Design a binder for these strands. Structure first.
Ligand SMILES: [Mg+2]
Ligand SMILES: [Mg+2]
Ligand SMILES: [Mg+2]
Lengths: 501, 1208
RNA sequence: AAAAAAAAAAAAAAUUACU
RNA sequence: GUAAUUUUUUUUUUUUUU
């Protein structure tokens, strides 16, 4: 007994590559569970959406060891009804409740089924990369079993004992399903449809897998291509499924590409991101601000500028975007000026990459007082020697966060957000969690992850690669994942799911 | 004709003419305002300017009345005193004034077009002056001022005191009042617009300053210094200047105590007993004498120069410790206005709830086990303060993890929801689905859980809450800021329930968490009283300045590391919508993903710790929706107090292990922590104790907390309770008799008197004159609450009046307002104040027919059914037993007015009102709602405990539903459905039913009697033998241990006779209090104890069903049985009485301590219950008649009918 | 019949205290 | 010394312009 009835939502299982076997003891069992679902939903609707004895229900269905019979009568009327149905099945045991290990699947389970799970031992089928393992006991008996066709495997369906009633086809030959179906005689077989990609690269430490939310045709990449080619599509739609740090870098090439199941955005992400879209749309809010935290070197500026245009076009309003280096580049110029300017157009013009930050000048002279001038001297230090230097860099950061003075960080973001000519919608980037008390007064702060080894993009760069790697470690030590984590493909998905006007 | 010329003002007794005179003169002050204006502003009061008298310690002082010009001639309203940001989205960043500025009342005009920013700013600034200032506890503010001035007149028999001229020089502007408050508009109307905007509050300041004079804290000349200091702060802005000098005008006492040099002080045992007295030195160490320099300079320039010379005088004229204690009590009355400090919540927002970043930034711990989304499942600290805290805390993670396994967390969450608190607002689409009555009750957490019970196990329920905002809600408090709080919805409050359940278990494995002020008596300060009696000890009462805002996002991770450690070692399936399952997981060192078995407690705590949004949101009338910055701990949560407690005790106790691993010793004996209050006690060498205290403060700075170190040799503070050398200094100004915070004056009748009785009780052991506190409260009940107004239907208006007029005087209003009913006031007799089920206030000597008087009842006089004895006492019990009659003398009780008073009690008006409100509650909806909540926890044990109650009720014993655990769900939904205000159709049913009972009772009303009233017929005779005093009477004659316990006083003598607290009784009370959740204070008068003890004596073999009905597990069954066994040594069921723990603060709870003072003939012991009964008769008499107790032995006499009632 | 302004009568939603 | 106040709808009359 699956948690979602496959006879009703058969298109939902086809997303996972699960096609129902045609129309046996297993054919009889999937029809029985479909009658139990209809009975349970009819019983739940009669008391405010709840089952009155979720433990008796769970024991009758999943253990099959309870009988209720009339020989009070109104309190056990629903349990007497479910009892005679299950008696008519004459099963040797009870129907086990089956769940997937997917977040999308769990979001679609009915409410009355969720009330049973507390009083059952469910059978949870794991998923590797969003796809449940087809070798499971229940998945093998109820659905068709996939057969993966590759390039070293392409032959007629006769070379193997394949039947169209027990096998589905996963075309991984790189060729069209129409050529495979006609030039090789798979006309009577059902092909599974995957819309994403699953790329495997070469990493510094090994091989890295990445899931992308684009089709293999839309994403113009083949085996052997480069990481920098089509980089913005990977960054906008890709999520690396390895442990951090992965070894991905600008020297990676593709070893294998395959169609894969397309990823679902997280629920906690779409909730906090749509909490920001409420403020953008509402008229009871004057200033709206989304704070975005990320690691140094993630490529968040390249993305959050495109996210800001897609939000301005959909909302119809002007959206401002301060970089994470906005205050430090301003402070480098106006640290001695007694009455500096806080105009949005002045701050925006200092936010270019050719302006040096105030924090980069202090960490540069700090690394010299210890004798560090190259990346190789820094990577040779022990952990305790590095941490002892970050504690001195923490003294330079605390001095700009401690008060609200003219050149403080809190006053900067106050005079910029509350300015007359500043856009009503702002997107501010941050570096560490302590800037919570200084950056604009908001209700929505997120942490952005990309497909980027941040320590690898910092040591494989120019323009002061040792200060950039040192500040990346200093900020990392101040930025846990205590705010909601989002991906670039989830932040774009929230704009599309919102109903504008 | 005048209150100070009455004969009650010269005798302080109630004769048949003194009582009728004071009755008519006080009712004249409560009814019409022409008499009040005449009383306050009579021309016979000659204004005085120069005054001279004695200060609080008997030295001479001279003062002059001074009223600044900014109050008599205020300035024009300056719109630059409340600026805005250039975007006008909020107030300016650093703005000087958060409270009401002093300007001319009519100077604030709103000449802007509506629906505009400057119009909204002025429509709100108008509400700051007209609405946020009316905060009165009992009645109108001019009635409350009349009550304070009446008592100051009757006590001093004169009118020439400095407070009368302040009242006349401040509020006498014309022939009417400068302002009044209309209860209809809920607003203050100004009659004189040329007046200061701040004056409506100064009516309360006069009430508070006159309250301190009646209390013995201030003298008449010190009332000038106090009123001159308050008016000096009101020159620019009253509240802004008071908060700025609050601490500087108080922290001088440690220097004054140093200059005293020597002090003879009491010495406390470890078991709550005074065992001796010693002379010690009050000299502070060298590191404390260094702070005297900086504090001298601050007082010299920030303080009102007339107030500063009082402190310099207090600091040089003090010779004993009792001198510093008296001067210090006065400077609290001079710096605390007494009111509750209220303003616009937009103006106090940034100073109360904005995050702040102190000395150092807190860094992250290394993540060891992670998620598929890289959200920490397990972490560890490499170094820093997180490593220091976990070195102590990680040694409790295994014992806590097993205590968590033995809890049903779904049933625990249903009992945590005993709150009828809002959460959020229902949706019309959602509202339509439930329909009607149910949505009218949805301002409760238990009802919002019942409506949405279908999705309790649905995981999407959690993500939908991250989309809802956290509604900000603020509270008021005397002498502090507004301090907005967060109100979470049932779903975000759920994510904080497992972190709360885990960190709550550590309270059972240590002794460094203060239980709080649970006991209510001197048992709360028992540790301080002991440790301040030792030598070579350093006392540290350290305070974290704004801890709630100082907790940053990374500081919260130190508690996350503790909670995630416990959650990973437990085995909890099925917590909420979570279940234990195999989970894909990342690990450190390993390059690919692993698979682990994660339980439900781990999934809940891991999701909560990685989705943290602490910013609250307030919907403002000026600016729309206002949001805070991120970082401030929400402080409305389940684990808001267990977080601060666990984090602080892990830093203090972990720094103890850090110093030991460095080769340094620790001098730390105990620490007591509750929230952000810390109390450290070091004993040892002077440099050893200072070394340990400095590193303790430095580790708190390393955690991003700012704090001030007030170290002392001879004083310590914890939870607003100051102990100085084995002596308790009470804070009497922290209690406002005249102001309140909630705009709901609950207690429309007979429950406001319970509120005044509970407020007077809190003031006894923190006041220098409890007999002047009795005259005050008597006039508060005679003037402020003596009218009862209700609306009566016009077809029954004349019938209720004509029938009620025979017992009490009634007031009627306009004939035709063109409505169905008109409102009708009710003026209750003064005798109602001293009657049971009525006022229940301590009485004055009433005169009997033979010419003798009753007792002058003290502040230790018991309440409850014991007040019924006054009916027989004025009837001369002594003459009553001589004739062997049990009769009331109904003629005399009618002259004083007891017959009319007792009749009004028999109407049971408040009970009558709540019956018509419950008739509109449909039990079909309450039962359907309760049915759906039962499918969420434990699947049973509501029906089982309900049946145990009914199978109990079929026999003699019937428990009340609030006791029975099976009706726990209903009793809240009744409260949720009764929280609604009374409608107009219900006021008719009230009037109709009230009219029926009046024509039923008033036919021939005689004071009724029960057979059990024969227990009241007992008296006492004074012998010629002087009883001996307890040895701890010599130990308390030097440096009394309370303000009301000075040598020779009545509170001192009651200690020398009865003794101190019962240590074995208070220990059994602290146990029965820890069995009840959402339970602040337990008393032996509580329903569960009284109902359970009644069956334990009657039918003990039915006590198991009682335990099933209340759902008492084997731990609580032993805690209750252990207390039933001890209470039966001295308890009694038949003779009920009520004493409060705040009332007998130092005094004994056990009646048996009074049996050494009274002689009883052995022929009177005719029954098994006689001994405990007679011990009560004498225990209650010695506390009531303590003012005339010269130390002689008593002899008990008994009525022949009392002996007959006891025999059987 | 197109609109604006006010008077009467009825309906709609509507003030809020966390642990 | 009461039962009112925000915004929205419908019908009822008043006056102004086509
Ligand atoms: Mg403290
Ligand atoms: Mg504090
Ligand atoms: Mg505190």
């Amino acid at each position: 007994m699956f948690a979602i009835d496959p006879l009703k939502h058969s298109k939902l299982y086809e997303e996972y590559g699960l096609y129902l076997r045609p129309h046996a003891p297993t054919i009889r069992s999937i029809k029985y569970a479909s009658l139990i679902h209809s009975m349970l939903a009819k019983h739940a609707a009669r008391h405010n959406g709840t089952l009155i004895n979720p433990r008796m229900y769970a024991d009758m269905i999943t253990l099959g060891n309870t009988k209720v019979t009339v020989t009070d009568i109104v309190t056990y009327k629903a349990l007497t009804e479910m009892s005679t149905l299950i008696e008519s099945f004459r099963l040797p045991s009870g129907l086990a409740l089956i769940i997937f290990d997917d977040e999308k699947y769990q979001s679609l389970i009915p409410n009355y089924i969720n009330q049973l799970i507390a009083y059952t031992q469910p059978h949870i089928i794991p998923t590797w990369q969003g796809i449940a393992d087809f070798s499971d006991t229940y998945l093998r008996s109820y659905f068709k079993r996939p057969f993966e066709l590759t390039a070293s495997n392409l032959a007629a369906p006769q070379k193997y004992n394949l039947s169209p009633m027990t096998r589905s086809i996963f075309n991984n030959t790189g060729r069209e399903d129409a050529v495979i179906r006609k030039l090789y005689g798979y006309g009577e077989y059902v092909f599974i449809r995957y819309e994403g990609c699953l790329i495997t690269w070469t990493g510094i430490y090994g091989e890295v897998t990445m899931m992308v939310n684009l089709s293999k045709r839309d994403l113009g990449l083949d085996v052997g291509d480069d990481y920098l080619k089509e980089y913005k599509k990977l960054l906008f739609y890709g999520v690396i499924t390895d442990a951090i740090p992965s070894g991905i870098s600008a020297r990676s090439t593709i070893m294998k590409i395959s169609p894969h199941k397309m990823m679902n955005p997280s629920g906690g992400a779409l909730a906090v991101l749509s909490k920001f879209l409420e403020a953008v749309v509402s008229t009871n809010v004057i200033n709206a601000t989304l704070v975005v935290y990320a690691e140094k070197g993630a490529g968040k500026t390249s993305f959050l500028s495109t996210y800001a245009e897609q939000l301005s076009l959909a909302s119809g309003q002007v959206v401002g975007h301060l970089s994470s280096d906005a205050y430090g580049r301003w402070l480098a110029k106006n640290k001695d000026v007694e009455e500096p300017s806080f105009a949005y157009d002045y701050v925006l013009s200092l936010d270019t990459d050719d302006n040096e930050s105030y924090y980069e000048q202090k960490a540069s002279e700090l690394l010299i007082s210890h004798g560090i001038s190259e990346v190789a001297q820094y990577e040779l230090l022990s952990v305790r020697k590095k941490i002892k230097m970050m504690d001195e860099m923490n003294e330079v950061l605390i001095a700009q966060l401690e008060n609200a003075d003219t050149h403080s960080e809190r006053n900067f973001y106050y005079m910029v957000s509350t300015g007359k000519t500043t856009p009503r919608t702002l997107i501010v980037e941050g570096h560490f969690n302590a800037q919570d008390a200084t950056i604009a007064r908001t209700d929505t702060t997120v942490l952005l992850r990309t497909i980027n080894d941040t320590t690898q993009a910092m040591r494989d760069r120019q323009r002061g690669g040792v200060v950039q790697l040192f500040l990346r470690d200093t900020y990392y030590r101040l930025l846990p994942a205590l705010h909601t984590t989002v991906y670039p493909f989830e932040m774009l998905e929230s704009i599309r799911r919102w109903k504008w006007v | 004709t005048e209150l100070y010329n009455t004969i009650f003002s010269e005798t302080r007794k109630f004769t048949r003419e003194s009582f009728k005179e004071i009755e008519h003169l006080t009712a004249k002050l409560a009814n019409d305002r022409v008499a009040r204006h005449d009383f306050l502003f009579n021309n016979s009061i000659a204004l005085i300017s120069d005054y001279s008298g004695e200060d609080s310690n008997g030295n001479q002082l001279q003062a002059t009345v001074t009223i600044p010009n900014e109050i008599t001639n205020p300035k024009e309203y300056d719109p630059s005193d409340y600026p805005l940001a250039e975007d006008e989205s909020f107030f300016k960043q650093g703005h000087k004034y958060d409270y009401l500025v002093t300007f001319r009342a009519g100077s604030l005009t709103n000449t802007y077009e509506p629906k505009t920013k400057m119009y909204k700013l002025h429509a709100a600034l108008d509400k700051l002056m007209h609405v946020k200032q009316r905060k009165s506890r009992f009645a109108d503010l001019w009635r409350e001022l009349c009550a304070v001035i009446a008592s100051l007149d009757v006590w001093y028999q004169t009118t020439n005191y400095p407070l009368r001229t302040y009242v006349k020089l401040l509020f006498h502007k014309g022939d009417e009042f400068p302002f009044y408050e209309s209860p209809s508009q809920d607003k203050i109307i100004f009659n004189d617009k040329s007046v200061a905007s701040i004056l409506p509050t100064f009516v309360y300041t006069c009430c508070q300053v006159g309250t301190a004079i009646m209390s013995g804290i201030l003298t008449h000349v010190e009332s000038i210094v106090a009123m001159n200091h308050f008016l000096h702060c009101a020159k620019d802005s009253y509240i802004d200047e008071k908060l700025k000098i609050k601490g500087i005008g108080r922290s001088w006492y440690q220097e004054a105590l140093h200059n005293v040099g020597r002090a003879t002080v009491p010495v406390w045992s470890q078991f709550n007993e005074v065992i001796g007295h010693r002379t010690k030195t009050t000299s502070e160490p060298h590191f404390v004498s260094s702070t005297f320099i900086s504090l001298r300079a601050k007082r010299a320039e920030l303080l009102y120069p007339e107030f500063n010379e009082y402190i310099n005088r207090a600091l040089r004229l003090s010779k004993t410790q009792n001198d510093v204690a008296n001067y210090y009590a006065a400077c609290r009355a001079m710096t605390n206005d007494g009111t509750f400090l209220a303003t616009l919540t937009e103006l106090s927002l940034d100073a109360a709830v904005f995050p702040r970043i102190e000395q150092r930034l807190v860094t992250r711990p290394a993540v060891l086990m992670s998620n598929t989304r890289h959200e920490s499942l397990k972490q560890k600290y490499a170094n820093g303060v997180g490593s220091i805290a976990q070195s102590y805390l990680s040694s409790f993670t295994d014992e806590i993890a097993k205590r968590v396994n033995g809890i049903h967390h779904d049933e625990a969450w249903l009992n945590f929801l005993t709150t009828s608190s809002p959460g959020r607002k229902l949706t019309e689409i959602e509202k339509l689905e439930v329909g009607g009555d149910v949505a009218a009750w949805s301002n409760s957490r238990i009802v919002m859980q019942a409506v949405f019970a279908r999705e309790y196990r649905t995981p999407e329920r959690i993500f939908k809450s991250l989309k809802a905002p956290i509604k900000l809600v603020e509270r008021q408090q005397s002498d502090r800021r507004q301090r907005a709080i967060s109100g979470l919805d049932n779903d975000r409050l759920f994510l904080s329930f497992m972190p709360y359940t885990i960190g709550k278990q550590i309270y059972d494995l240590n002794d460094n968490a203060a239980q709080g002020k649970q006991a209510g008596n001197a048992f709360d300060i028992g540790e301080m009283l002991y440790w301040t009696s030792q030598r070579n000890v350093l006392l540290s009462s350290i305070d974290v300045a704004g801890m709630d805002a100082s907790v940053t996002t990374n500081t919260k991770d130190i508690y996350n590391t503790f909670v995630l450690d416990v959650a990973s070692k437990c085995t909890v399936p099925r917590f909420g919508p979570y279940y234990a399952k195999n989970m894909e997981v990342f690990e450190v060192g390993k390059r690919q993903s692993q698979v682990k078995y994660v339980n439900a407690a781990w999934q809940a705590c891991a999701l909560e710790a990685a989705n943290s949004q602490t910013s609250t949101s307030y919907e403002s009338e000026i600016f729309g929706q206002v949001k805070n910055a991120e970082g401030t701990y929400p402080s409305g949560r389940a684990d808001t107090s267990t977080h601060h407690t666990v984090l602080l005790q892990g830093l203090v106790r972990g720094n103890e292990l850090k110093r030991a691993s460095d080769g340094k010793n620790s001098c730390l004996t105990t620490i007591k922590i509750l929230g952000d209050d810390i109390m450290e006690i070091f004993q040892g060498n002077e440099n050893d104790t200072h070394d340990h205290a400095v590193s303790n403060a430095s580790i708190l700075n390393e955690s991003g907390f700012a704090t001030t170190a007030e170290l002392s040799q001879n004083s310590i503070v914890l939870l607003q309770q100051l102990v100085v050398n084995g002596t308790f200094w009470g804070f009497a100004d922290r209690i406002s008799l005249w102001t309140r915070e909630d705009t709901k004056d609950i207690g429309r009748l007979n429950l406001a008197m319970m509120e005044l009785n509970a407020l007077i009780d809190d003031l006894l052991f923190r006041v220098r004159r409890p007999e002047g506190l009795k005259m005050l409260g008597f006039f508060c009940g005679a003037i402020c609450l003596r009218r009862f107004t209700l609306s009566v239907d016009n077809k029954l208006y004349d019938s209720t009046y004509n029938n009620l007029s025979k017992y009490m005087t009634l007031v009627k209003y306009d004939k035709n307002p063109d409505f169905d009913s008109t409102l009708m006031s009710l003026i209750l007799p003064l005798a109602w104040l001293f009657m049971p089920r009525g006022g229940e206030y301590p009485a004055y000597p009433f005169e009997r027919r033979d010419g003798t008087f009753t007792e002058d009842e003290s502040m230790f006089t018991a309440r409850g059914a014991y007040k019924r004895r006054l009916l027989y006492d004025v009837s001369n019990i002594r003459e009553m037993i001589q004739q062997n009659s049990m009769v009331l003398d109904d003629d005399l009780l009618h002259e004083y007015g007891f017959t009319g008073a007792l009749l009004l009690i028999d109407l049971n008006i408040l009970d009558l009102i709540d019956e018509v409100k419950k008739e509109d509650i449909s039990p079909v909806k309450v039962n359907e709602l309760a049915t759906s909540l039962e499918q969420l926890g434990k699947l049973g044990e509501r029906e089982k405990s309900r049946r145990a109650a009914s199978d109990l009720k079929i026999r003699g014993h019937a428990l009340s539903n609030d006791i029975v655990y099976g009706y726990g769900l209903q009793e809240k939904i009744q409260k949720s459905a009764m929280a609604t205000k009374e409608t107009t159709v219900q006021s008719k049913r009230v009037s109709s039913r009230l009219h029926e009972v009046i024509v039923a009772k008033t036919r021939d009303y005689k004071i009724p009697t029960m057979p059990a009233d024969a227990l009241h017929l007992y008296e006492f005779e004074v012998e010629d033998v002087t009883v001996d005093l307890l040895p701890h009477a010599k130990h308390t004659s030097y440096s009394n241990l309370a303000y009301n316990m000075s040598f020779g006083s009545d509170g001192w003598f009651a200690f020398a006779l009865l003794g101190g607290l019962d240590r074995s009784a208070n220990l059994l009370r602290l146990d029965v209090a820890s069995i009840r959740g959402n339970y602040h204070k337990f008393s032996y008068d509580d329903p569960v104890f009284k109902q359970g003890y009644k069956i334990y004596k009657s039918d003990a073999t039915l006590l198991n069903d009682f335990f099933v009905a209340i759902s008492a597990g084997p731990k609580e069954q032993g805690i209750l049985l252990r207390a039933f066994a001890y209470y039966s040594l001295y308890g009694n069921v038949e003779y009920h009485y009520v004493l409060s723990p705040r009332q007998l603060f130092f005094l004994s709870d056990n009646p048996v301590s009074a049996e050494r003072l009274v002689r009883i003939p052995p022929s009177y012991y005719v029954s098994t219950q006689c001994r405990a009964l007679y011990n009560i008769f004498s225990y209650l008499h010695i506390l009531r008649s303590i003012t005339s107790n010269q130390g002689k032995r008593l002899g008990m006499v008994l009525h022949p009918g009392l002996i007959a009632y006891v025999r059987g």
